[PDB]
RNA sequence: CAAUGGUAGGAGAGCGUUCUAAGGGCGUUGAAGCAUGAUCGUAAGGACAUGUGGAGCGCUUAGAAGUGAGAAUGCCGGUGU
RNA sequence: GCAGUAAAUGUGGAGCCGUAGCGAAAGCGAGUCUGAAUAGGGCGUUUAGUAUUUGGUCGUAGACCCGAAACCAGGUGAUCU
RNA sequence: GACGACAUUAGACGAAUCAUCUGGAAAGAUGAAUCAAAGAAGGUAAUAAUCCUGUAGUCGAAAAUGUUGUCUCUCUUGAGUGGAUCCUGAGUACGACGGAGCACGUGAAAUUCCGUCGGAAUCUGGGAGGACCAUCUCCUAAGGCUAAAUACUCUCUAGUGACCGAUAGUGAACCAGUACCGUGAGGGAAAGGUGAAAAGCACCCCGGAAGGGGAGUGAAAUAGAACCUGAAACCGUGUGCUU
């Protein structure tokens, strides 16, 4: 469009609300803060989660668990995610990274089963679920744990 | 999709096939607006500042005691209500430039070029072959091509002679195929592009 | 700067699939002679954070 | 007050109470005034007791 | 056909001010300011005429804000009683 | 980060979010945890997210403005007393 | 040290417009031209690409300094085999006690320092891999030097800004850290604008003077030096209608 007649997209822009400018705006004197107390003061208000001296929720409740410094968490691929290849293709972690079905291998590729194959192909990933292995084999085509 | 190629005298030499994927799309005015706005906010070097009550010289002692004088309590001579000191919320140095996704940038370029191609504001020439910088000759070239006052000339690469030949004509700006930008295209009323530049733009812009 | 995480709360909740927070139970530390068997074994479970507490503490676990 | 031979000196740290109340403190070297042979002439100077453990002839 | 009192407060639509972009304009045959008038719009507010003034300033669309004062024993000036 | 005019933009795929959840974890996985249970129950499945940005609110920053008594650090004072 | 090399501390050249109207004066308007590797900018009696200073482009150093290139100069061996013996940083490493530092609250202190006392091994050695032992892996402390990428701006040069335009912008646009205050450290103002040109009112009159009224300069003199515009409060003098 022209540089003297340009228009933003309808509903994309909105004028911001300026506070404390006259009483016809509705936010004039007290500026939307009510009258007194902390909430009216500049920098007032209270720390989030504070409950006025009542024992806060996250100290009523107990801690639980620990973090394992070495979790082997895997990038997962489901069965219906493999129908985007052809029949007889040999699919490997590098190939499915290339095809973009896996954006990063986190600690390996685990094949799981949600859809179905409807195809015949061999797979070679780091881990398999029982259902995934059986469904790979049902149509013919092997699964190598690497 | 077919644009007749003209020589600098204005006569038809040949024709070129320019794609509808770069020069025949329906312009996206929302993306085009966002691109122009980003482009024009990118040129701001906001170097504005004021002095708040800390940056203003002096004013570190309490001007008078808190009670007993009959005067309003004050704490510094440079408080914002005082004359001569303390700006509360003034301009600060900052940048005004933001980013748009890459596909949106190329869609904005394509929409600008398509808008300039549907208004019959795209003229393709074969070459320029200016062997010396001469403004008068470029002015005659533009007049023979019947171009509006505002025109953007696009070369395949940096043609030094054409650049120099068109610096001093007011309302004519020179650019390369890679140097194309939405603000410059939308400013110009007409585009005069070399065939090689047209093909390069078609390659780059999808 | 970057907003900080309430580290005490992160040691107490786990986020669920729909965005809730699973929590443990109070009264499960000692004095088990003063609670009934039903109390003790039903306090051996997990609840969620109530939505009133949720609107209070939304931002403390924003990165979880 | 440094040691003549080693360079040992005082340093600063904290005194801590059972309730972990910090109060600034000092660690002085065990410096003793002894007559040693600096460059020919005998002279009395400060030397740490550890620098005298083995190697310095009063 | 129905609804339209309203404080804390929520929501929406707008009026003005400075600056910038592009277009289109006005100015020593007199710009902005200032003054007066019996003018126009639902409000914020917009014109016109005539004096003063003696060089700059509107309009459109869109972008940014040091964007709007009657009160703070407010600050500075001027001037009263 | 490099190139570019302190632009746009081009390149840059380290990274980040999503495509799967459950469990403290090992781990299993459209399920999983508890449990002796194929029971019951908790959280989950029977697709939409992501980047930029206008508006609103929150956090860290002095955070709407003015105002203590006071605290500490380094200096200046016995020409008054 | 000796030849060059650009760069900087003065500078030089540098295109193209005339006419009429209004006006005090045009750069404005109207008409007709021209230059442009120059239409950045600032001046000129109003708003100028072509009137001036300039700009693009090109040229320029006696001298005195950065910097870089050659070639002079000044230094000087460098591999491998064996390995029987020799060396490889001691009051050190480490430990206990007390502290400090590591994102980590003397504490697991791993890793690292200080003080006080203890206090090692020498390649078949020693240290580390978050207490600690084993295995394995990696490394070789207790001597020293080291450019670049990084930080900052009292200065200097060139420029930039949806930064301020005299209560703003520095405290300070003006003889400003100055009038002024304090014994002292210290604290700290207020105050820009005639006009294009000073052409800054010759002469006459009232007046001691100050002021003024004429005359005159000027486009304008309620532009007359407190001088552009000249709001409001406030103070007056006349009146139309009222009391």
Swiss-Prot record, chain A:
Residue ranges with Basic and acidic residues bias: 1-18
Listed GO biological process terms: translation
GO molecular function terms noted in the UniProt entry: rRNA binding; structural constituent of ribosome
Keyword annotations: Ribonucleoprotein, Ribosomal protein, RNA-binding, rRNA-binding
HAMAP family the record matches: Ribosomal_uL15 (MF_01341)
Listed name of the protein: Large ribosomal subunit protein uL15
Stretches for region Disordered: 1-54
Summary of the function given for this chain in its UniProt record: Binds to the 23S rRNA.
SUPFAM superfamilies reported in the protein's UniProt record: Ribosomal proteins L15p and L18e (SSF52080)
A cellular component term, taken from the record's GO annotations: cytosolic large ribosomal subunit
Pfam families, alphabetized: Ribosomal_L27A (PF00828)
InterPro entries to which the protein is assigned, alphabetical: Ribosomal_uL15, Ribosomal_uL15/eL18, Ribosomal_uL15/eL18_sf, Ribosomal_uL15_bac-type, Ribosomal_uL15_CS
Biased composition (Gly residues): 42-52
Assembly: Part of the 50S ribosomal subunit.
Record family assignment: Belongs to the universal ribosomal protein uL15 family.
Curated annotation (Swiss-Prot), chain B:
Pfam family membership, one: Ribosomal_L4
Domain of life per record: Bacteria
Biological process (GO), any one: translation
One Gene Ontology cellular component: ribonucleoprotein complex
Positions of the UniProt region annotated as Disordered: 49-75
Protein keywords: Ribonucleoprotein, Ribosomal protein, RNA-binding, rRNA-binding
InterPro entries: Ribosomal_uL4, Ribosomal_uL4-like, Ribosomal_uL4_dom_sf
Subunit structure: Part of the 50S ribosomal subunit.
Name of the molecule in the record: Large ribosomal subunit protein uL4
Lineage, uppermost ranks: Bacteria, Bacillati, Bacillota, Bacilli, Bacillales
Gene designation per UniProt: rplD
From Swiss-Prot, chain C:
Highest taxon of the lineage: Bacteria
Pfam families: Ribosomal_L35p
InterPro entries: Ribosomal_bL35, Ribosomal_bL35-like, Ribosomal_bL35_CS, Ribosomal_bL35_sf
GO biological process, one term: translation
One of the record's GO molecular function terms: structural constituent of ribosome
Record field: compositional bias (Basic residues): 1-15, 37-48
Region (Disordered): 1-48
Keyword hit for tRNA processing: no
NCBIfam families membership: rpmI_bact
Family the UniProt entry places it in: Belongs to the bacterial ribosomal protein bL35 family.
Stated name of the protein: Large ribosomal subunit protein bL35
Provenance organism: Staphylococcus aureus (strain MW2)
Record gene name: rpmI
From Swiss-Prot, chain D:
Taxonomic superkingdom: Bacteria
Region of interest (Disordered), ranges: 1-20
UniProt KW keywords: Ribonucleoprotein, Ribosomal protein
GO molecular function: structural constituent of ribosome
Cystines in this chain: none
Homology family: Belongs to the bacterial ribosomal protein bL28 family.
Identification of the protein by name: Large ribosomal subunit protein bL28
Organism of provenance: Staphylococcus aureus (strain MW2)
């Amino acid at each position: 469009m022209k540089l003297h007649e340009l228009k933003p997209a309808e509903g994309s822009r909105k004028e911001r609300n300026r506070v404390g400018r006259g009483v016809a705006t509705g936010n004039g004197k007290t500026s939307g803060r009510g009258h007194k107390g902390q909430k009216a003061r500049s920098g007032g208000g209270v720390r989030p989660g504070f409950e006025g001296g009542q024992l806060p929720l996250f100290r009523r409740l107990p801690k639980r668990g620990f973090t394992n410094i070495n979790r082997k968490e895997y990038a997962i691929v489901n069965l219906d995610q493999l129908n985007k290849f052809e029949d007889g293709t040999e699919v490997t972690p590098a190939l499915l990274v290339e095809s973009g079905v896996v954006k990063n291998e986190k600690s390996g590729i685990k094949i799981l089963g949600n859809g179905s194959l409807d195809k015949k192909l061999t797979v070679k990933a780091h881990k398999f679920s029982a259902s995934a292995a059986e469904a790979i084999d049902a149509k013919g085509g092997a699964h190598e744990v690497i | 999709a077919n644009y007749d190629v003209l020589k600098l005298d204005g006569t038809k030499s040949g024709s070129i096939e320019l794609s509808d994927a770069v020069f025949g799309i329906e312009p996206n005015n929302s993306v085009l607006f966002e691109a122009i706005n980003l482009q024009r906010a990118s040129l701001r070097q906001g170097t504005h500042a004021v002095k708040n009550r800390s940056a203003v010289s002096g004013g570190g002692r309490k001007p008078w005691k808190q009670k007993g004088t009959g005067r309003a309590r004050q704490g510094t001579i440079r408080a914002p209500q005082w004359r001569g000191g303390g700006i509360v919320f003034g301009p600060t140095p900052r940048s005004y430039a933001y980013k748009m996704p890459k596909k949106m940038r190329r869609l904005a370029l394509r929409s600008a070029l398509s808008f300039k191609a549907q208004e019959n504001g795209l003229t393709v020439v074969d070459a320029f072959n200016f062997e010396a910088p001469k403004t008068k000759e470029f002015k005659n070239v533009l007049s023979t091509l019947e171009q509006p006052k505002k025109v953007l000339v696009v070369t395949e690469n940096e043609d030094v002679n054409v650049e120099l030949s068109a610096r001093n004509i007011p309302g004519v700006q020179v650019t390369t195929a890679q140097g194309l930008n939405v603000l410059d295209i939308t400013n110009a009323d007409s585009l005069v592009i070399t065939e090689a530049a047209a093909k390069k733009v078609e390659e780059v812009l999808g | 700067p970057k907003m900080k995480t309430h580290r005490g709360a992160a040691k107490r909740v786990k986020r669920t699939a729909s965005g809730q927070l699973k929590r443990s139970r109070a009264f499960t530390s000692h004095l088990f002679a003063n609670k009934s068997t039903k109390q003790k074994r039903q306090l051996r479970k997990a609840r969620l954070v109530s939505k009133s507490d949720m609107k209070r503490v939304k931002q403390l676990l924003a990165y979880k | 007050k440094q040691c003549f031979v080693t360079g040992r000196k005082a340093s600063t740290g904290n005194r801590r109470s059972h309730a972990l109340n910090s109060t600034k403190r000092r660690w002085n070297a065990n410096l003793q005034k002894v007559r040693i042979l600096v460059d020919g002439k005998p002279k009395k100077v400060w030397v740490s007791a550890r620098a005298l453990k083995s190697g310095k002839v009063t």
